[PDB]
Amino acid sequence: EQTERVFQISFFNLPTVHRIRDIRSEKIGSLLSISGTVTRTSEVRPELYKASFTCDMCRAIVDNVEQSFKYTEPTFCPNPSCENRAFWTLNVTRSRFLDWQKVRIQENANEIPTGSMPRTLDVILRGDSVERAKPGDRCKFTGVEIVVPDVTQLGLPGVKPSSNSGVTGLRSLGVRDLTYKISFLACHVISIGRDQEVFLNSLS
Amino acid sequence: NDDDNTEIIKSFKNFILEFRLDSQFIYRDQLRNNILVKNYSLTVNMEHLIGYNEDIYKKLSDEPSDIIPLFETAITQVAKRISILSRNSLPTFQLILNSNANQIPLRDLDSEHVSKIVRLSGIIISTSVLSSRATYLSIMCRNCRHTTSITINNFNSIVSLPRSCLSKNCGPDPYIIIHESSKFIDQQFLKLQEIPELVPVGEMPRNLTMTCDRYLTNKVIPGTRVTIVGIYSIYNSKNSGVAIRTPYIKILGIQSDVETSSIWNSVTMFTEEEEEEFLQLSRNPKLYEILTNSIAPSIFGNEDIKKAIVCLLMGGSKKILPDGMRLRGDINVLLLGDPGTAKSQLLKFVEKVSPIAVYTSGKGSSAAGLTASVQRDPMTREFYLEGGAMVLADGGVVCIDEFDKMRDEDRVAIHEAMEQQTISIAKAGITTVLNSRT
Amino acid sequence: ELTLESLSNVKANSYSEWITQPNVSRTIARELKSFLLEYTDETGRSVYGARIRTLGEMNSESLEVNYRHLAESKAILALFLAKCPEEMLKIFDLVAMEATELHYPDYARIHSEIHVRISDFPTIYSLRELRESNLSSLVRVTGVVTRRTGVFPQLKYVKFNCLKCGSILGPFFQDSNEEIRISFCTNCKSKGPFRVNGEKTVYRNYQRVTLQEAPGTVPPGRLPRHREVILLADLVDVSKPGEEVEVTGIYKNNYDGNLNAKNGFPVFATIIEANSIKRREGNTANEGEEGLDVFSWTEEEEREFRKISRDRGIIDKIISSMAPSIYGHRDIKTAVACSLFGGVPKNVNGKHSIRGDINVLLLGDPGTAKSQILKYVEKTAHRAVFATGQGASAVGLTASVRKDPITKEWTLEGGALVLADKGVCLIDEFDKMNDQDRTSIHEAMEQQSISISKAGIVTTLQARCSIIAAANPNGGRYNSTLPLAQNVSLTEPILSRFDILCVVRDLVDEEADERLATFVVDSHVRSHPENLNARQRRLQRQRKKEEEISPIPQELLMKYIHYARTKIYPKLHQMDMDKVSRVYADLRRESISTGSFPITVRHLESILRIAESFAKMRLSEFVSSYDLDRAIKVVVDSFVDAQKVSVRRQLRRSFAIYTLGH
Amino acid sequence: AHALSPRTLTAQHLNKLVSVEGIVTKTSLVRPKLIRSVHYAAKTGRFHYRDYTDATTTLTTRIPTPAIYPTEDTEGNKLTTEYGYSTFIDHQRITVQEMPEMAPAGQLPRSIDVILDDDLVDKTKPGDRVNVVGVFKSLGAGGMNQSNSNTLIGFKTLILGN
DNA sequence: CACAC
DNA sequence: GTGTGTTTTTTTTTTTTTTT
Ligand SMILES: Nc1ncnc2c1ncn2[C@@H]1O[C@H](COP(=O)(O)OP(=O)(O)OP(O)(O)=S)[C@@H](O)[C@H]1O
Ligand SMILES: Nc1ncnc2c1ncn2[C@@H]1O[C@H](COP(=O)(O)OP(=O)(O)O)[C@@H](O)[C@H]1O
Ligand SMILES: [Mg+2]
Ligand SMILES: [Mg+2]
Ligand SMILES: [Zn+2]
Ligand SMILES: [Zn+2]
Ligand SMILES: [Zn+2]
């Protein structure tokens, strides 16, 4: 029952702590320590991490398929006898999954200028960092500021693109444009807002 | 398949032409009489078919949806043989079945029984308007103008336009309906509710959709208790799991007890024997006492109350003057007194005995739910009126228990209708004055 | 030829692939056959052989196999089941079908297949603690039913027919999670439209229930989570909407484009395939019990019920065991037992219907364990629904209509009395809610029906409830010198429905105080948490503590109550109408003359109802003379205690001629 | 027997001229529609007309026209749509329901859709009692298009008022 | 339906 | 050349329900 151990590196205690107002897209692909008040949290769902597909004929197994924001699947069968460019059956048992949650944070009350609406943001939590930031608790997140394109424009087997500057011209796009949305991906979060023998052992 | 179809058709034709109990060809005579009054239908009793030949009944019960159209074709051929001198344009007849099989409870209908014959009971709660299903369909080829005809069985298997020209390619959809030459029949959608005495404990009643056809359309009205013998069929509605299928019933027989739409279509559906029995009963000098004793026998005493109930159930005679205003013929009776005097029992008995009767609770009653409710159509986004409780009792009686628990804004809404026998609604752009002679 | 130890040391990398090995499959089949035929408990009988007997007899098609039994003997089978249930469900179902064939030859006619409902799963979860590691494995989550679709027939063996060339496709097994995919046709590689064959196709029942995190287990101030469970054939329509239940099943997942589009990640949506169900609504204080049905009684249990029924004095022992933790108040205990067993609802020719449920009202000073009595009743009865004071509105008691958020139409959902149908409804602080809410239950407690005529929805529900209410006398204290109506705020019609009315007075008597305080302290010491493995040792300690106070075990008393309610229909053939008629006439005579208690025909029917309950609690199918005299004495005593003390002595003197013998 | 009411208008009267009495309840907005488009070719000085037919316009069934103005002649000549010379007709769609007073006990009034065209538009308003004489025509596909093979939806039925 | 992907 | 994809809507107005 060998189980490939994936690891989740948790960075914390960065020299600087930004905020929603301090968000700048030029910091994409970098580590920050955003602190904000949690207002809304999603559920704990399993998200595909390392896909493991099987081609419909000749049964060749494609494993360790990297997954982007889309539902990407392998496009070529490694066995040069299988005609498969879009037809596969994902081996649900063999594929790797991650516990995943989408939390919603907003600007802290003290950081709000008078009259201005407090600004919100969406953060992605994975692994043990899930369910550690309940709504109402101001938490000091930390991780990477990423951007999610609109996967509807990217093209999906089940959905279609739906209808202020969008870029276009990709091979996979064709004629439609692509829009982007800033999000955070946290590797660590901290909120900043029984037998006798058990108590003795848990006591210094 | 054609040979088997011909075999079954000929067997059914022989059954029709030969079946008889004692010197009277019952089905031949019934078919002739139905043709005489332009009633192109036939009520076939199940025990008769079973007794004639068990093999035919087994073949019918195995795949009714395919056997029945052949039976209808045989009926049409028999009608042509024994109602028109050889050497047309006669519509295909509609089959009606009557059985005595065990009535399966409505909630007992399950993944099995699909495409079988099912007998059950219920109460009608909704009767949609009559739509039209095509039987003869004249069709025209789009490019090469090759006109043909299609015959539709209306028995869905589990049909579309042909996907080829059939005699240049003309496209994969080369056919258009010729409306002025096609033939159509009426179809009605009913919604049945399971019997309240048969619901599970702590369970809301289960609804079920079904479809009438032709001579079975407009046979009953909502609020009536009926029994249906039909086919438990399946259709896929595109409106939330995977491979889910909507169940329903295709009707093949109705057995009501409160007659057809209206009060026997506002006319006498009374056979001669029962009419003569009614006349004989009317000549009884002690008929008043017999009726009084027949009102709530389990309730001791209360003779004057029983006589007043008899008067109410009879009611006066409606008068319509030439000048325009009318005089109602209903009686309004209130029963006050100490609790535990079987007043609620009397109202329940009245609701039980009255041909048209709606029993309502005082607290569980709203003005919009008693006469008419303005509701927005989910699909068409349009407002429409849905009849209230007292409207369903039109031409009958409403037994309102806990009359002291009328909401003062709800009690007043009945003042017009209990006297004028009319309901005026001016809501959501709808201005109507319906009749409620209750 | 593989051993159980050979099952223990896995060879294939994944457990499911290990199970797919044919020799492993045959070995597991034979081992499960042996486990079914030979599993023996402490009493020595083979449980599963009798289970197959019952499965055949009632044609249940479902074999409820406890997880604990399979864990204790041949444990690696239970470990595999908790890890890879998907294939062994099929294999164990086939083995159960073969065993049924052994007991019941050619059982395949009645049921082609058999299912298995695994019970008592150890790892209980919640809709907040689920993680991806639980995929393709059994869980025992707990939740409240929120939505429940209809019983849809669903494709089992789809046999498509090719449109281009072919005419038959293989009977693919519909997963019931994702739509069946055909891809390139087998007859020809070209792709085209497909549709099923109506000749050879079979269907299974399908229901789409939605469990939500229970309000009890949700941390306060936090939103509750929800997950969806599919009920397959033979499992549909088992839990009503709004019911709190425990579901054991597989935690599967599938892909949908909508979720990926909404969240922007290749995330799947989880889903639960039901395997067994236990309703836990109304028995949240009944933990420590085994089996999916607590009120379920075995054949030996029914035999024990019959044996103890023939015992004389069983009525008194049952009465004393109503409130073992509550000292004294024997009349209240008797009334509670009568309402619990209840009478037979008469229905004359389908025209006249007679209520067969007993409604009891307890008026008494605070701190008299009336609330504790109601809590015991809620924990005790088969179907119990508890509501308190203003915390229950008029519509929430019986029924309410609402516009459907998804389909946009009015639909009716039952209230408290609907969920308590053919059960019991308890009303704490019956004097403290709104009178307009209190009047909404007249039809419910007398006609045993709920009529709704609102928003174009007109119907008549049925609520065969047994109303038990608790109130507080005016000013918080009961003035015995005054008539009962003056000590209450309620009217006659609400007083009339209640068959039995018990008045509790808080006096100061040194002997009574001594005994009550001693009993309470003894119970509290007995109730102290600090007061051959751990399980049966704990059970023995609990039985030791119970036998001090309970003449009959409560876990057996509740089964006996359920059995008597569902299988005893006593008849009143052996009785004397003269005594009952005279008693009713005298009751009305003393009520009209210097009296305020309403004595109506409902009250006369109450005597027969209480006699029927007395016959029920002895499992008697005919109301004996003792069952009638006891009911008459109870009724006359309840009437007398409802009168002022000034005329109470004279009324008791008049009534003494009717309670002869006791 | 052709003097009927919306309740009694059974399917047997399709393609038959009937007279129905009722109350006007809903009236759609007056909307003109094309029946004939006129185009001018500014390379030959010629006028080309194209007649447009619809199931709701002509009684006899004909191939529906895609309602596209031909901007080019057959001989590669650009055509300009000549409004004013093209032909449009006023169209309306009203709802006629039976009398509430002859509505049978326990039933609400039923309604049918009528298509007034050309002169008949705006000749009636909601709340008016009326008797219309016209053809009981049927429209729609009623499924039968592989979109609804087993689904039991019927056909669109209405009256072309004369 | 039909023009654009 | 075979087969798609739109256009495509949740307002205002009733009715109910809990608080107020
Ligand atoms: N004269 C009578 N004969 C027979 N049964 C009677 C008589 N009077 C009362 N009853 C019984 O007493 C009970 C009365 O219950 P209900 O009819 O529901 O209440 P009610 O008499 O209408 O008065 P309410 O509704 O409380 S104001 C029923 O069980 C009747 O059978
Ligand atoms: N007869 C009794 N025997 C044992 N305990 C009692 C008795 N009467 C009252 N109590 C105790 O009093 C406490 C409170 O009673 P409570 O349910 O508030 O009475 P009430 O419902 O009349 O207000 C309970 O914990 C119960 O144990
Ligand atoms: Mg009553
Ligand atoms: Mg209390
Ligand atoms: Zn391959
Ligand atoms: Zn052609
Ligand atoms: Zn093929």
PDB file of C-alpha atoms in Angstrom, chain A residues 1-2 41-48 56-57 67-71 83 87 90 97-102 124 131 134-137 146 148 151-152 156-159, chain C residues 10 12-16 83 127-128 130-133 135-136 183-184 189 219 222 225-227 251 253 255 257-270:
ATOM      1  CA  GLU A   1       0.000   0.000   0.000  1.00  0.00           C
ATOM      2  CA  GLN A   2       2.736   2.441  -0.990  1.00  0.00           C
ATOM      3  CA  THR A  41     -15.357  30.172   3.247  1.00  0.00           C
ATOM      4  CA  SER A  42     -16.110  27.434   0.719  1.00  0.00           C
ATOM      5  CA  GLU A  43     -16.297  23.700   1.383  1.00  0.00           C
ATOM      6  CA  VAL A  44     -13.615  20.997   1.560  1.00  0.00           C
ATOM      7  CA  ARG A  45     -13.580  19.496  -1.927  1.00  0.00           C
ATOM      8  CA  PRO A  46     -11.032  17.165  -3.568  1.00  0.00           C
ATOM      9  CA  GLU A  47      -9.173  18.792  -6.462  1.00  0.00           C
ATOM     10  CA  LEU A  48      -7.167  16.864  -9.038  1.00  0.00           C
ATOM     11  CA  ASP A  56      -9.727   4.024 -24.382  1.00  0.00           C
ATOM     12  CA  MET A  57      -8.066   1.388 -26.600  1.00  0.00           C
ATOM     13  CA  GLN A  67      -3.146  19.920 -14.074  1.00  0.00           C
ATOM     14  CA  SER A  68      -3.541  23.628 -14.769  1.00  0.00           C
ATOM     15  CA  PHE A  69      -6.626  25.664 -13.845  1.00  0.00           C
ATOM     16  CA  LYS A  70      -8.481  23.891 -16.679  1.00  0.00           C
ATOM     17  CA  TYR A  71      -9.488  20.197 -16.948  1.00  0.00           C
ATOM     18  CA  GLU A  83      -5.461   6.657 -31.798  1.00  0.00           C
ATOM     19  CA  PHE A  87     -10.678  10.202 -25.497  1.00  0.00           C
ATOM     20  CA  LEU A  90      -9.351   8.933 -15.722  1.00  0.00           C
ATOM     21  CA  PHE A  97      -6.137  14.677  -5.070  1.00  0.00           C
ATOM     22  CA  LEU A  98      -5.818  17.573  -2.636  1.00  0.00           C
ATOM     23  CA  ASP A  99      -8.238  18.917  -0.063  1.00  0.00           C
ATOM     24  CA  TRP A 100      -9.225  22.349  -1.350  1.00  0.00           C
ATOM     25  CA  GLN A 101     -11.179  25.344  -0.060  1.00  0.00           C
ATOM     26  CA  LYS A 102     -11.943  28.843  -1.368  1.00  0.00           C
ATOM     27  CA  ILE A 124      -7.138  29.092  -1.984  1.00  0.00           C
ATOM     28  CA  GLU A 131     -10.756  24.979   7.761  1.00  0.00           C
ATOM     29  CA  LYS A 134     -13.430  30.496   9.949  1.00  0.00           C
ATOM     30  CA  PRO A 135     -15.504  33.539   8.915  1.00  0.00           C
ATOM     31  CA  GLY A 136     -15.238  36.562  11.186  1.00  0.00           C
ATOM     32  CA  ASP A 137     -11.668  35.795  12.250  1.00  0.00           C
ATOM     33  CA  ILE A 146      -1.553  34.075  -8.302  1.00  0.00           C
ATOM     34  CA  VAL A 148      -6.786  32.667 -12.397  1.00  0.00           C
ATOM     35  CA  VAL A 151     -11.553  28.760 -17.683  1.00  0.00           C
ATOM     36  CA  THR A 152     -14.753  29.181 -19.706  1.00  0.00           C
ATOM     37  CA  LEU A 156     -14.027  22.954 -21.285  1.00  0.00           C
ATOM     38  CA  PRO A 157     -15.687  19.663 -22.283  1.00  0.00           C
ATOM     39  CA  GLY A 158     -18.785  20.487 -20.230  1.00  0.00           C
ATOM     40  CA  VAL A 159     -19.295  24.263 -20.381  1.00  0.00           C
TER      41      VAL A 159
ATOM     42  CA  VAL C  10      -1.430  -7.854   0.032  1.00  0.00           C
ATOM     43  CA  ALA C  12      -1.114  -6.131  -5.649  1.00  0.00           C
ATOM     44  CA  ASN C  13      -0.116  -2.518  -5.040  1.00  0.00           C
ATOM     45  CA  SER C  14      -3.678  -1.229  -4.628  1.00  0.00           C
ATOM     46  CA  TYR C  15      -6.215  -2.962  -2.397  1.00  0.00           C
ATOM     47  CA  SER C  16      -8.979  -2.848  -5.017  1.00  0.00           C
ATOM     48  CA  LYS C  83     -11.118   0.473   2.434  1.00  0.00           C
ATOM     49  CA  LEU C 127     -20.098  17.036   6.491  1.00  0.00           C
ATOM     50  CA  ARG C 128     -17.338  19.353   7.785  1.00  0.00           C
ATOM     51  CA  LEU C 130     -14.691  14.886   5.226  1.00  0.00           C
ATOM     52  CA  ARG C 131     -11.365  14.671   3.387  1.00  0.00           C
ATOM     53  CA  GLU C 132     -10.249  13.324   0.013  1.00  0.00           C
ATOM     54  CA  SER C 133      -8.607  10.291   1.651  1.00  0.00           C
ATOM     55  CA  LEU C 135     -12.757   8.551  -1.425  1.00  0.00           C
ATOM     56  CA  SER C 136     -13.936   5.107  -2.578  1.00  0.00           C
ATOM     57  CA  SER C 183     -17.353   6.725 -27.436  1.00  0.00           C
ATOM     58  CA  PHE C 184     -16.477   5.003 -30.745  1.00  0.00           C
ATOM     59  CA  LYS C 189     -15.220   2.942 -35.254  1.00  0.00           C
ATOM     60  CA  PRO C 219     -20.615  24.836  16.249  1.00  0.00           C
ATOM     61  CA  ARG C 222     -21.463  28.790  11.999  1.00  0.00           C
ATOM     62  CA  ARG C 225     -22.427  22.013   5.567  1.00  0.00           C
ATOM     63  CA  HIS C 226     -24.417  19.811   3.200  1.00  0.00           C
ATOM     64  CA  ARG C 227     -23.634  16.778   1.036  1.00  0.00           C
ATOM     65  CA  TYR C 251     -17.834   8.475  -0.599  1.00  0.00           C
ATOM     66  CA  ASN C 253     -16.505  11.564  -6.644  1.00  0.00           C
ATOM     67  CA  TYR C 255     -16.282  15.322 -12.706  1.00  0.00           C
ATOM     68  CA  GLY C 257     -17.786  21.067 -15.974  1.00  0.00           C
ATOM     69  CA  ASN C 258     -19.949  23.492 -13.996  1.00  0.00           C
ATOM     70  CA  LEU C 259     -17.897  23.168 -10.801  1.00  0.00           C
ATOM     71  CA  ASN C 260     -14.617  23.677 -12.672  1.00  0.00           C
ATOM     72  CA  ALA C 261     -16.066  26.721 -14.442  1.00  0.00           C
ATOM     73  CA  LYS C 262     -17.318  28.209 -11.164  1.00  0.00           C
ATOM     74  CA  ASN C 263     -14.126  27.592  -9.175  1.00  0.00           C
ATOM     75  CA  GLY C 264     -11.515  27.715 -11.942  1.00  0.00           C
ATOM     76  CA  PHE C 265      -9.858  24.493 -10.754  1.00  0.00           C
ATOM     77  CA  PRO C 266      -9.980  20.856 -11.920  1.00  0.00           C
ATOM     78  CA  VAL C 267     -11.916  19.941  -8.770  1.00  0.00           C
ATOM     79  CA  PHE C 268     -14.540  17.199  -8.699  1.00  0.00           C
ATOM     80  CA  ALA C 269     -17.777  17.095  -6.714  1.00  0.00           C
ATOM     81  CA  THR C 270     -18.176  14.398  -4.068  1.00  0.00           C
TER      82      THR C 270
END
